[PDB]
Design a protein around this ligand. Structure first.
Ligand code: ZN
Ligand code: ZN
Length: 603
């Protein structure tokens, strides 16, 4: 019965594709109300090409379905993950969420004030990493494009919305898990570029002004690269409290309740009316009443496009998806801390006690800063060090908020970690190492099979040798900067760089995490970049003496490296390393004549 909100958007699609627009009574949508369907050509594929460069240089890992833009792929993820409704919080829980959100918004806005983002900033982003136009940069250079933005912006000021419709492109696996980089059914969403700017214009200040940064929220890690994250966990462990907990919420984006949207939407109260006049219509029309285009398999070998709507979820493609998820997750963990400390009873979920609203405010006013400082929240990933170990059994308000934990019974006690180095965070754990010179360094680490698996695969077909070589070099230089402590990766990274020409600039996408800042994507010597990253820019390195050679860069212990998937000690690797020059030359022959550098002697 939300037809009025989504009336204009559906009709525009229906009118534009009226020659094929129709109604399909056999649609499988359950939690989405279905409007109509029109025919489209099949877009995308399920072909994941193997990286020949990485393949020949990782022969022992030959023993070691990924990204489905196919219309069959889009429907499968929608049927299993997207098409669901998270239960709304009860009355008592909602007040707790509302009080926490108000306190957090006032806290995160203590020094920063909301502002409107200009098109010049948006033009800066598109130039720095389509139906009529064929390029994003070409569109922003067209005055006709900005007219479409203006007319749609005028509609928002008039209380209307016509073009802010989402596109369900398909699936992109969330994690690289068991092996081969295959885990997670994450849904990727695309939206029109004009709507992207209007969203950026109204809510871009959350990202551009770093509202979720650690110096602002005290619990967020926004803007911190993977190198900085390790020291954060060690610093949290220095604080008093109990064990460290890192619980994943299964389908977090699909479990964003309508109360969560409302609680995040009270930032408009901190904005100027002129700014609110632009942001208020957008949140109501784009987030709170979505219009989504999904391809569905059809009969006679034809593909069809559906138009549907809902009210609650998070689009996962919203420009402030990460920032809003960090805000709500920080609120969720703070609420669970209150239940663990006895402030919130399991019965107060249905109805809060008499004075337990100002008392919650009192607890946040006193313990909010201290509790947040012992948290590390990146989107839906979280690490919390609570006051005591009663936090493990404080599952009532957590499950009431539909933030059900992943791969665990609903009411089974959560288990914490005794050593901060074992705590998972952003698909990584962190090891503490002592260098040859005696200095200590905290490094990110994850199972080696996951790292090799993603490099071996390339998105789509039609890859040239030059393109797939630069992507391989990007993986190799990334390994040297982040995973230098892994013996197999360091040897394999040099092998790629020895096989790939020196002058070639690395390209491609080697990481999906927002914490991958791509310092490895330069042609500068990685040893020089390594000194800048881990010594010069390292706030936890008082002694700024630079490292003079790669041999001074430490490895993990053979016990800790073997535990995390290294193939040292196996006969297969011993042969692989001894004869590593043979695969290097084969790639050089295939590429052709060029200038190269041999990096094996540096090992
Ligand atoms: Zn709109
Ligand atoms: Zn490890």
């Amino acid at each position: 019965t939300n037809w009025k909100m989504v009336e204009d958007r559906v009709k525009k699609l229906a009118d534009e594709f009226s020659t094929t627009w129709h109604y399909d009574s056999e649609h499988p949508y359950k939690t989405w109300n279905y409007h109509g369907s029109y025919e489209v050509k099949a877009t995308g594929s399920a072909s994941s090409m193997v990286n020949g460069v990485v393949r020949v240089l990782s022969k022992p890992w030959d023993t070691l379905a990924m990204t489905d833009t196919t219309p069959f792929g889009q429907q499968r993820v929608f049927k299993e993950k997207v098409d669901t409704k998270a239960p709304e919080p009860p009355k008592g829980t909602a007040e707790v969420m509302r009080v926490t959100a108000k306190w957090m918004w006032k806290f995160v806005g203590r020094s920063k004030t909301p502002r409107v983002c200009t098109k010049e900033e948006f033009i800066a982003k598109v130039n720095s990493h389509q139906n009529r136009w064929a390029s994003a940069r070409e569109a922003v250079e067209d005055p006709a494009f900005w007219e479409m933005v203006d007319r749609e912006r005028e509609a928002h000021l008039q209380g209307r919305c016509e073009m802010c419709t989402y596109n369900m492109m398909g699936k992109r696996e969330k994690k690289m898990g068991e092996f081969g980089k295959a885990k997670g059914s994450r849904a990727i969403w695309y939206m029109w570029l004009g709507s992207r700017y209007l969203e950026f214009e109204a809510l871009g200040f959350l990202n551009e002004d770093h509202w979720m940064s650690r110096e602002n929220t005290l619990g967020g890690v926004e803007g911190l690269g993977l190198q900085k994250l390790g020291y954060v966990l060690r610093d949290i462990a220095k604080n008093p409290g109990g064990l460290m907990y890192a619980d994943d919420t299964a389908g977090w984006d699909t479990r964003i309740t309508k109360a969560d949207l409302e609680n995040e939407s009270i930032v408009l109260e901190m904005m100027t009316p002129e700014h609110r006049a632009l942001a208020e219509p957008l949140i109501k029309f784009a987030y709170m009443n979505k219009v989504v285009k999904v391809m569905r398999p059809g009969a006679d070998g034809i593909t069809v496009m559906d138009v549907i709507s809902r009210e609650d979820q998070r689009g996962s493609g919203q420009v402030v998806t990460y920032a809003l998820n960090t805000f709500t997750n920080l609120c969720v963990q703070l609420i669970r801390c209150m239940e663990g400390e006895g402030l919130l009873k399991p019965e107060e979920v249905e109805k809060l006690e008499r004075g337990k609203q100002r008392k919650i405010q009192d607890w946040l006013d006193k313990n909010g800063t201290e509790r947040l400082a012992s948290m590390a929240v990146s989107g839906d990933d979280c690490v919390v060090k609570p006051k005591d170990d009663r936090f493990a059994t404080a599952l009532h308000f957590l499950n009431s908020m539909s933030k059900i934990r992943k791969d665990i019974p609903e009411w089974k006690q959560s288990t914490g970690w005794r050593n901060w180095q074992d705590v998972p965070f952003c698909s990584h754990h962190f090891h503490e190492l002592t260098m040859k010179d005696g200095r200590q360094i905290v490094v990110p680490c994850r199972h080696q099979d996951e790292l090799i698996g993603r490099a071996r695969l390339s998105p789509g077909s039609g890859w040239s040798l030059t393109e797939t070589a630069c992507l391989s070099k990007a993986y190799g230089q990334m390994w040297l900067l982040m995973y230098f402590h892994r013996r197999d990766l360091r040897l394999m990274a040099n092998a790629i760089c020895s096989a790939v020409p020196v002058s070639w600039v690395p390209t491609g996408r080697t990481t999906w995490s927002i914490h991958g800042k791509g310092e490895w994507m330069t042609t500068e010597d990685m040893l020089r970049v390594w000194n800048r990253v881990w010594i010069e820019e390292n706030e936890h390195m008082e002694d700024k003496t630079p490292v003079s050679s790669w041999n001074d860069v430490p490895y993990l212990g053979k016990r800790e490296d073997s535990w995390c998937g290294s193939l040292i000690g196996h006969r297969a690797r011993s042969t692989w390393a001894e004869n590593i020059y043979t695969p290097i030359m084969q790639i050089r022959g295939l590429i052709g004549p060029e200038r190269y550098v041999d990096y094996m002697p540096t090992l």
